[PDB]
Amino acid sequence: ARHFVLNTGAKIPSVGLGTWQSDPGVVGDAVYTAVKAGYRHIDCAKVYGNEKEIGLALKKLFEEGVVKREDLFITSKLWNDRHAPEDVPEALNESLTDLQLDYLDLYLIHWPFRVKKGTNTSPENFITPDIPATWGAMEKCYDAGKARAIGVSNFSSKKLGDLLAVARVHPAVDQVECHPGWQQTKLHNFCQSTGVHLTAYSPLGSPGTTWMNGNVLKEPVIISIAEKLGKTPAQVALRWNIQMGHSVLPKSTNEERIKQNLDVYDWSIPDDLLAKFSEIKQARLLRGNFIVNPQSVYKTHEELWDGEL
Ligand SMILES: NC(=O)c1ccc[n+]([C@@H]2O[C@H](COP(=O)([O-])OP(=O)(O)OC[C@H]3O[C@@H](n4cnc5c(N)ncnc54)[C@H](OP(=O)(O)O)[C@@H]3O)[C@@H](O)[C@H]2O)c1
Ligand SMILES: O=C(O)C[NH2+]CP(=O)(O)O
């Protein structure tokens, strides 16, 4: 159950290590520990500002021969201020340089939101997005070999469809918040109809992110299934996603939890308990408030997510 196949033909490891909110000092240790524990997928982003430290952990892993480059799946993201087409390949080169890699396995457009280059998310820096023109430039990065695959993040069904419709190179991945508390059934079917792979982020419901206020591991359905199967709630939440055909990016800096997050491969959730996830109530934890604004192109949360709310 360890790989899913993207529409490019390449294999994406089912479990990846999320690196959002891993302070520079400790992210290297975590990438190092996870890969020695058997991880083959690392999810990065340039806006996280820790890619230099991630790069050095990767090179140490290569230097000790723990793995080779081709053994690993490395993702990063194009941040909102580099959507202009000549800015795209330069932003990829910067993340490539910091990671000390020659190519990424996956390069995602982080958000369907644009601000002028070199500025922060603030209403005097908003630029109306042009996803098609940005995707054209993502495509040339793919053509040049710098990104094995390209895809997107935080794209609703409608937005993903609107991009597929115009694209030459179909996005390989839509990476979105997805967990037993936010099951993304609509987008999940749409991805299956389109050949687009869904990677689940915040698959534990991000318990450490205060502002999102997630208590997914504390759902009684998940706790019940956890002890009927003799597994932790985290394992069962992750297993649920993998069984729906989604890859998962659990974020951890604890070595013992890093390893248990990998132990999702050789046991199943029977259909009888799988059915009970429909009894979990549904709240989107990461609402995208920072780009919903009277001056944003998204004035409502419904406008950003296209009703997937
Ligand atoms: N593209 C996007 O918009 C976007 C947005 C958010 C996240 N992501 C990606 O997806 C990754 C994961 O999402 P996330 O970081 O928001 O949340 P998450 O992985 O659902 O949960 C992270 C929290 O869960 C804890 N945890 C980890 N393993 C556990 C276990 N076995 N039992 C109990 N608790 C556990 C971690 O603490 P410890 O560190 O102490 O283990 C951490 O505080 C990110 O790191 C990032 O790479 C992408
Ligand atoms: O989605 C991401 O991981 C990057 N921005 C996160 P935010 O600025 O909403 O905290």
PDB file of all heavy atoms in Angstrom, residues 203-217:
ATOM      1  N   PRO A 203      -2.984  15.680   8.368  1.00  0.00           N
ATOM      2  CA  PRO A 203      -3.805  14.462   8.458  1.00  0.00           C
ATOM      3  C   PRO A 203      -4.108  14.031   9.886  1.00  0.00           C
ATOM      4  O   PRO A 203      -4.920  13.115  10.086  1.00  0.00           O
ATOM      5  CB  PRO A 203      -2.945  13.413   7.744  1.00  0.00           C
ATOM      6  CG  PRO A 203      -1.526  13.845   8.072  1.00  0.00           C
ATOM      7  CD  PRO A 203      -1.551  15.359   8.188  1.00  0.00           C
ATOM      8  N   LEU A 204      -3.457  14.624  10.880  1.00  0.00           N
ATOM      9  CA  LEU A 204      -3.839  14.421  12.266  1.00  0.00           C
ATOM     10  C   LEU A 204      -4.756  15.525  12.762  1.00  0.00           C
ATOM     11  O   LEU A 204      -5.122  15.533  13.942  1.00  0.00           O
ATOM     12  CB  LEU A 204      -2.591  14.325  13.137  1.00  0.00           C
ATOM     13  CG  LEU A 204      -1.725  13.140  12.717  1.00  0.00           C
ATOM     14  CD1 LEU A 204      -0.487  13.008  13.613  1.00  0.00           C
ATOM     15  CD2 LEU A 204      -2.573  11.852  12.712  1.00  0.00           C
ATOM     16  N   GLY A 205      -5.163  16.435  11.873  1.00  0.00           N
ATOM     17  CA  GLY A 205      -5.910  17.604  12.279  1.00  0.00           C
ATOM     18  C   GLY A 205      -5.070  18.634  12.984  1.00  0.00           C
ATOM     19  O   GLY A 205      -5.606  19.423  13.765  1.00  0.00           O
ATOM     20  N   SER A 206      -3.755  18.633  12.742  1.00  0.00           N
ATOM     21  CA  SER A 206      -2.784  19.580  13.288  1.00  0.00           C
ATOM     22  C   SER A 206      -3.036  19.926  14.756  1.00  0.00           C
ATOM     23  O   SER A 206      -3.349  21.082  15.071  1.00  0.00           O
ATOM     24  CB  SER A 206      -2.784  20.856  12.452  1.00  0.00           C
ATOM     25  OG  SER A 206      -1.575  21.575  12.609  1.00  0.00           O
ATOM     26  N   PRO A 207      -2.896  18.967  15.679  1.00  0.00           N
ATOM     27  CA  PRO A 207      -3.133  19.280  17.104  1.00  0.00           C
ATOM     28  C   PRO A 207      -2.221  20.365  17.683  1.00  0.00           C
ATOM     29  O   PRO A 207      -2.623  21.056  18.630  1.00  0.00           O
ATOM     30  CB  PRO A 207      -2.901  17.927  17.793  1.00  0.00           C
ATOM     31  CG  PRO A 207      -3.181  16.903  16.728  1.00  0.00           C
ATOM     32  CD  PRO A 207      -2.679  17.525  15.454  1.00  0.00           C
ATOM     33  N   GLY A 208      -1.009  20.537  17.160  1.00  0.00           N
ATOM     34  CA  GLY A 208      -0.122  21.542  17.718  1.00  0.00           C
ATOM     35  C   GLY A 208      -0.347  22.956  17.227  1.00  0.00           C
ATOM     36  O   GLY A 208       0.259  23.889  17.766  1.00  0.00           O
ATOM     37  N   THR A 209      -1.186  23.145  16.210  1.00  0.00           N
ATOM     38  CA  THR A 209      -1.465  24.476  15.683  1.00  0.00           C
ATOM     39  C   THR A 209      -2.617  25.059  16.488  1.00  0.00           C
ATOM     40  O   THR A 209      -3.772  24.659  16.312  1.00  0.00           O
ATOM     41  CB  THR A 209      -1.798  24.435  14.194  1.00  0.00           C
ATOM     42  OG1 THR A 209      -0.849  23.603  13.515  1.00  0.00           O
ATOM     43  CG2 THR A 209      -1.742  25.834  13.617  1.00  0.00           C
ATOM     44  N   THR A 210      -2.292  26.003  17.372  1.00  0.00           N
ATOM     45  CA  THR A 210      -3.279  26.519  18.317  1.00  0.00           C
ATOM     46  C   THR A 210      -4.505  27.071  17.593  1.00  0.00           C
ATOM     47  O   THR A 210      -5.637  26.642  17.857  1.00  0.00           O
ATOM     48  CB  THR A 210      -2.633  27.583  19.222  1.00  0.00           C
ATOM     49  OG1 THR A 210      -2.513  28.831  18.522  1.00  0.00           O
ATOM     50  CG2 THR A 210      -1.242  27.133  19.690  1.00  0.00           C
ATOM     51  N   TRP A 211      -4.287  27.977  16.625  1.00  0.00           N
ATOM     52  CA  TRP A 211      -5.391  28.757  16.068  1.00  0.00           C
ATOM     53  C   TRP A 211      -6.414  27.892  15.341  1.00  0.00           C
ATOM     54  O   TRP A 211      -7.589  28.272  15.254  1.00  0.00           O
ATOM     55  CB  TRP A 211      -4.863  29.857  15.139  1.00  0.00           C
ATOM     56  CG  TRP A 211      -3.734  29.485  14.223  1.00  0.00           C
ATOM     57  CD1 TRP A 211      -2.404  29.441  14.537  1.00  0.00           C
ATOM     58  CD2 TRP A 211      -3.827  29.164  12.827  1.00  0.00           C
ATOM     59  NE1 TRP A 211      -1.668  29.093  13.429  1.00  0.00           N
ATOM     60  CE2 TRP A 211      -2.514  28.917  12.367  1.00  0.00           C
ATOM     61  CE3 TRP A 211      -4.896  29.050  11.923  1.00  0.00           C
ATOM     62  CZ2 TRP A 211      -2.238  28.558  11.047  1.00  0.00           C
ATOM     63  CZ3 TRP A 211      -4.622  28.700  10.606  1.00  0.00           C
ATOM     64  CH2 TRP A 211      -3.300  28.456  10.182  1.00  0.00           C
ATOM     65  N   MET A 212      -6.007  26.726  14.833  1.00  0.00           N
ATOM     66  CA  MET A 212      -6.957  25.868  14.131  1.00  0.00           C
ATOM     67  C   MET A 212      -7.840  25.051  15.071  1.00  0.00           C
ATOM     68  O   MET A 212      -8.933  24.650  14.659  1.00  0.00           O
ATOM     69  CB  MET A 212      -6.230  24.933  13.163  1.00  0.00           C
ATOM     70  CG  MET A 212      -5.854  25.626  11.887  1.00  0.00           C
ATOM     71  SD  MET A 212      -4.231  25.137  11.292  1.00  0.00           S
ATOM     72  CE  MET A 212      -4.504  23.425  10.884  1.00  0.00           C
ATOM     73  N   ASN A 213      -7.400  24.796  16.309  1.00  0.00           N
ATOM     74  CA  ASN A 213      -8.234  24.168  17.344  1.00  0.00           C
ATOM     75  C   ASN A 213      -8.772  22.808  16.881  1.00  0.00           C
ATOM     76  O   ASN A 213      -9.987  22.585  16.794  1.00  0.00           O
ATOM     77  CB  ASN A 213      -9.386  25.097  17.767  1.00  0.00           C
ATOM     78  CG  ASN A 213      -9.020  26.023  18.928  1.00  0.00           C
ATOM     79  OD1 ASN A 213      -9.891  26.449  19.681  1.00  0.00           O
ATOM     80  ND2 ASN A 213      -7.732  26.332  19.077  1.00  0.00           N
ATOM     81  N   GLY A 214      -7.842  21.897  16.601  1.00  0.00           N
ATOM     82  CA  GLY A 214      -8.181  20.563  16.127  1.00  0.00           C
ATOM     83  C   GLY A 214      -8.110  19.528  17.235  1.00  0.00           C
ATOM     84  O   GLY A 214      -7.124  19.456  17.974  1.00  0.00           O
ATOM     85  N   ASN A 215      -9.169  18.720  17.335  1.00  0.00           N
ATOM     86  CA  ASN A 215      -9.280  17.629  18.304  1.00  0.00           C
ATOM     87  C   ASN A 215      -9.684  16.332  17.610  1.00  0.00           C
ATOM     88  O   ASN A 215     -10.506  15.564  18.118  1.00  0.00           O
ATOM     89  CB  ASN A 215     -10.275  17.980  19.410  1.00  0.00           C
ATOM     90  CG  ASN A 215      -9.961  19.307  20.075  1.00  0.00           C
ATOM     91  OD1 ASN A 215     -10.763  20.239  20.029  1.00  0.00           O
ATOM     92  ND2 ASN A 215      -8.786  19.402  20.691  1.00  0.00           N
ATOM     93  N   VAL A 216      -9.096  16.062  16.441  1.00  0.00           N
ATOM     94  CA  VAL A 216      -9.540  14.936  15.625  1.00  0.00           C
ATOM     95  C   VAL A 216      -9.193  13.601  16.289  1.00  0.00           C
ATOM     96  O   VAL A 216     -10.011  12.668  16.301  1.00  0.00           O
ATOM     97  CB  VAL A 216      -8.944  15.042  14.208  1.00  0.00           C
ATOM     98  CG1 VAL A 216      -9.391  13.859  13.337  1.00  0.00           C
ATOM     99  CG2 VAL A 216      -9.346  16.365  13.557  1.00  0.00           C
ATOM    100  N   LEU A 217      -7.980  13.486  16.853  1.00  0.00           N
ATOM    101  CA  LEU A 217      -7.549  12.247  17.502  1.00  0.00           C
ATOM    102  C   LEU A 217      -8.388  11.909  18.718  1.00  0.00           C
ATOM    103  O   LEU A 217      -8.218  10.852  19.337  1.00  0.00           O
ATOM    104  CB  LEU A 217      -6.079  12.357  17.895  1.00  0.00           C
ATOM    105  CG  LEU A 217      -5.190  12.544  16.666  1.00  0.00           C
ATOM    106  CD1 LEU A 217      -3.712  12.432  16.997  1.00  0.00           C
ATOM    107  CD2 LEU A 217      -5.576  11.532  15.585  1.00  0.00           C
TER     108      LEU A 217
END
